[PDB]
Design a protein around this nucleic acid. Structure first.
Ligand SMILES: [Mg+2]
Ligand SMILES: [Mg+2]
Ligand SMILES: [Mg+2]
Ligand SMILES: [Mg+2]
Ligand SMILES: [Mg+2]
Ligand SMILES: [Mg+2]
Ligand SMILES: [Mg+2]
Ligand SMILES: [Mg+2]
Ligand SMILES: [Mg+2]
Ligand SMILES: [Mg+2]
Ligand SMILES: [Mg+2]
Ligand SMILES: [Mg+2]
Ligand SMILES: [Mg+2]
Ligand SMILES: [Mg+2]
Ligand SMILES: [Mg+2]
Ligand SMILES: [Mg+2]
Ligand SMILES: [Mg+2]
Ligand SMILES: [Zn+2]
Lengths: 103, 122, 53, 122, 206
RNA sequence: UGGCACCUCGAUGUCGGCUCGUCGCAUCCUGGGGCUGUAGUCGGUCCCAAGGGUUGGGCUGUUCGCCCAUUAAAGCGGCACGCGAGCUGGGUUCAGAACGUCGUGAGACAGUUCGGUCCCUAUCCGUCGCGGGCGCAGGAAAUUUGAGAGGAGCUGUCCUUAGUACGAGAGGACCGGGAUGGACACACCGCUGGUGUACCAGUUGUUCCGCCAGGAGCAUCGCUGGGUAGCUAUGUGUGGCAGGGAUAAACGCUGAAAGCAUCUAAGCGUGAAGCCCCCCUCAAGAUGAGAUUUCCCAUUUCUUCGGAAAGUAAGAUCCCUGAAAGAUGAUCAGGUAGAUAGGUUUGGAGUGGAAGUGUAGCGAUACAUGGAGCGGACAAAUACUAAUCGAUCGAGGACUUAACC
């Protein structure tokens, strides 16, 4: 924790992120930026964990695609997320949902 | 924090015993390192006693020892160290924000040369 | 593992140069005039900082 | 992180089912391979009636690892298995179908047919 | 060629214009003052002497007050010298600000590394350890001291000892952001030392 | 491979491997060049060159070797066949037992087979770190020059020049420019992870706090799910860039001796990963003890001059609170001219919804009050507790000569 670090990094802090917890389903609109053309790709899944503080906070989303589990980790305040939707809210008892990997 | 020559549970037992001793007798003699740890322990206990509610009392009861300070004729009923902490010691420092103990250096012990010190709650 | 040669007197006395011990950090008590350690209670009158202990 | 003696599940249409890696290519003392790297390997299990037979020495490209990749914008990807695709001397597959998701890093290394044949490119 | 002194505040990240994510170190560089100029005709070499941080009068002595009284300033905690500079700049008693650097500059960072205490060979020198089973009684030991013929052991036989606390220079670091009002400099990467450590920031020599 | 029998039989441990290397050059790769049966591509051979580099497995106790798959390359030798008071003990080389063979036999075979005790608290030098003393013609606080020394030094692939030069075709470049790697090294914890025994939660047995409720002890931290600071790699940032001076082998210019010719004799020029620099670190005990800025000054007693001692100045320490430092010393931050540590008050990460009460349910339990309660080591304020009071050390500045004055 540092006050100067907080004041320096305050302007780059995204205010449009909604409220979500580990355990609920979200949809991420991520900008896939090729060399000259940028498109939008969608990733929908369950938030498995949330970690960190301030500008260096990250969150992970898990999905099952074509029979294989895929996990995807993002910074919360990155500009490459066009928008984040909370589809539904879950009822869990944990902060980290690692038991879903073995399940 | 200091490891005081002993494992986790032994250190916890030593801290609980010394904190209860300082609450009951209000002035004890010990070695310097033990005094510099029970400083923290006892002052957190006194803050909990100053707060005063049932949650704070149940938290202090998980650390204080079940010992008898005195018997009072009121049917003679005993008084316990938790009762003394919440009813006598805590109101004493209702107007002092911190620093309820002080440490006074005495000198070496004959048997092993350990530096002995006095700690009292004042 | 084992000494090849015995040690001479001069060599032993040279090694024992630093095996002395220091002199206590004491001064006189303002109250009773006796000697005492700094930052310690006076054992002859029980004083510290000019107060009874 | 695929080094010698690690086994991988084969994710394409050819007769192989499981493969043991023999060598990681691209330097004298190189030890581990990541997504998008080529390895020499041997077929441990095969499907009877396929093009690739048991005991064959082939080479393959890694298409998904259980310790995945980090992207330049600061995000990561990870999978629940290690999988490879058997390839020719050029970067073309030896099968007609590819199963499961494939990492986007195959496109930067110019594995175009594998990318086009995949059900999903994450 | 520019130079400045600062304190290491911490370590964080920023997002660039493209949306990239890069790690940065924060250097705080307030209260730099020019104290002395060394010339060839008086010293044998050319340099500028810079003092960095204000300190209380109780913590200084008469020689320090005398030295800083020529530059009309209060006593300074750190003082260093910069060579390979242009002395036609740098008036005595002038201020040095983070404005001397601009975003995109390439720098050299000098510091003193974090202290480790007494350490063994495989941590201090990256040695390889022995077998942990198969009857072995040789795990974290230095190795053979040498051959038999010299009747002695050579120099640079690496042995245990004190590890950290050395002067380190890291070259070719980029400046990401300059904040004049806060006196703050953001450098891509990391620098030697712990928090609150003194860092020299100089223009890269190559 | 041998010959000899000169040291060692009141003991010089003997194969292979592991750990750690260091040196030679008769050079395996990379750098420079001459000749070619050198058209090009790919090669051959010799000269210069030791700066750096020089793989993981299957079989065998093996060294060696054969094989598999790589690499720019998978060099050869010395150091008690380097290295057992550094490790191992598969093999050789004790006592048991067995096979083939030889012997009348007890037994034997460097033929084979299964099993078989590896001791030692470091005195001196040497090596790696850390202190104390004195010196450096007054006493002090900082900033430095650099004699000298150590480190680093490696290399692949792809694109373009260009399907150009060359060649009957087949095939196919030098030189130059651009991009991106392998192995290695240094630093650091923002990110991905690991650990995290005084952080949070769930749970089994039994004992205890008089009982319920709530808690405490023991069971590997009882077990199980997470995790702060710190420490870390497998994580991240950076490096070996671009060059200069003089050369090696070599190629030349000018040029006589020897009216010509000649790279040599006098005199010049090109010319290597090599040498000396450039880059990083240490460095004035460099007794040759260097330099710059600033501070204090010429006290008092005795001496027969020499000189001695005794109060101090500038400045430091004893002692005490500590961590960014640390085996201990040392280093650095402070001692009321105070935020050095603890407490306190506000926060933060982390965990995930406290107790009490109420409501629903026959009950296990669920819901509300309420992102609640707790919260080591992280942040900021605050003199509440402890850094009280003393004491000790520490200059008065030799002589000669020359310049100024
Ligand atoms: Mg301690
Ligand atoms: Mg003690
Ligand atoms: Mg893996
Ligand atoms: Mg395997
Ligand atoms: Mg340390
Ligand atoms: Mg240490
Ligand atoms: Mg062991
Ligand atoms: Mg003998
Ligand atoms: Mg093998
Ligand atoms: Mg190759
Ligand atoms: Mg040899
Ligand atoms: Mg050893
Ligand atoms: Mg002189
Ligand atoms: Mg057990
Ligand atoms: Mg646990
Ligand atoms: Mg170079
Ligand atoms: Mg909370
Ligand atoms: Zn007294």
């Amino acid at each position: 924790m540092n006050k100067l670090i907080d004041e320096i990094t305050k302007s780059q802090l995204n205010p449009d992120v909604p409220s979500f917890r580990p355990g609920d389903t979200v949809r991420v609109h991520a900008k896939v930026v090729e060399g000259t053309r940028e498109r939008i790709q969608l990733f929908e899944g369950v938030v498995i964990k949330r970690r960190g503080a301030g500008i260096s906070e990250t969150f992970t989303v898990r999905k099952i695609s074509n029979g294989v589990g895929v996990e995807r980790t993002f910074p919360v305040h990155t500009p490459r997320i066009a928008k984040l939707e909370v589809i539904r809210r879950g009822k869990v008892r944990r902060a980290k949902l690692y038991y879903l990997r073995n399940l | 924090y200091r490891k005081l020559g002993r494992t986790s549970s032994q250190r916890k037992a030593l801290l609980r015993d010394l904190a209860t001793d300082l609450i009951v007798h209000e002035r004890i003699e010990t070695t310097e390192a033990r005094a510099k740890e029970i400083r923290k322990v006892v002052e957190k206990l006194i803050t909990s006693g100053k707060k005063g509610d049932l949650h704070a009392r149940r938290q202090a009861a998980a650390f204080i020892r079940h010992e008898v300070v005195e018997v009072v004729q009121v049917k003679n009923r005993p008084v316990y160290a938790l009762q003394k902490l919440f009813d006598d010691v805590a109101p004493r420092y209702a107007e002092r924000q911190g620093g309820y103990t002080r440490i006074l250096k005495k000198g070496p012990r004959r048997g092993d040369g350990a530096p002995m010190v006095i700690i009292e709650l004042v | 593992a084992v000494p090849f040669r015995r040690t001479s007197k001069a060599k032993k006395r040279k090694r024992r140069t630093h095996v002395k011990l220091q002199l206590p950090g004491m001064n006189e008590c303002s109250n009773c005039g006796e000697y005492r350690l700094s930052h310690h209670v006076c054992p002859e009158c029980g004083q510290y900082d000019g107060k009874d202990v | 992180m695929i080094q010698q003696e690690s086994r991988m599940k084969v994710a394409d249409n050819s007769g192989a089912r499981e493969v043991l890696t023999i060598k990681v290519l691209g330097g004298s003392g190189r030890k581990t391979a990541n997504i998008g790297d080529v390895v020499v390997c041997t077929v441990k299990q095969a499907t009877p009636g396929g093009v690739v037979k048991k005991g064959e020495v082939v080479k393959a490209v890694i298409v998904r690892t259980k310790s995945g990749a980090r992207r330049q914008d600061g995000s990561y990807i990870k999978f629940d298995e290690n999988a490879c695709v058997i390839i020719r001397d050029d970067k073309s597959p030896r099968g007609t179908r590819i199963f499961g998701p494939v990492a986007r890093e195959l496109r930067e290394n110019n594995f175009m047919k594998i990318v086009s044949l995949a059900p999903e490119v994450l | 060629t520019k130079g400045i002194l600062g304190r290491k505040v911490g370590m964080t990240q920023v997002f660039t214009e493209n949306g990239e994510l890069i790690p940065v170190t924060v250097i705080e560089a307030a209260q730099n003052v020019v104290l002395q100029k060394k010339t060839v005709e008086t010293d044998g070499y050319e340099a500028v002497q810079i003092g960095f941080e204000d300190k209380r009068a109780k913590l200084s002595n008469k020689p320090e007050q005398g030295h800083v009284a020529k530059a009309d300033t209060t006593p300074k905690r750190f003082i260093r010298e910069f060579r390979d500079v242009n002395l036609d700049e740098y008036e005595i008693g002038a201020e040095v600000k983070v404005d001397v650097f601009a975003e995109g500059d390439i720098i050299d960072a000098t510091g003193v590394s974090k202290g480790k205490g007494f350490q063994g060979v495989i941590k201090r020198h990256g040695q390889s350890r022995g077998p942990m089973a198969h009857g072995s009684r040789y795990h974290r030991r230095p190795g053979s001291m040498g051959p038999v013929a010299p009747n002695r052991v050579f120099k640079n036989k690496l042995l245990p000892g004190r590890m950290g606390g050395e002067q380190i220079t890291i070259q070719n670091l980029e400046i990401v952001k300059v904040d004049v009002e806060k006196n703050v400099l953001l450098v891509k990467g990391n620098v030697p030392g712990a928090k609150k450590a003194l860092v020299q920031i100089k223009t890269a020599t190559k």
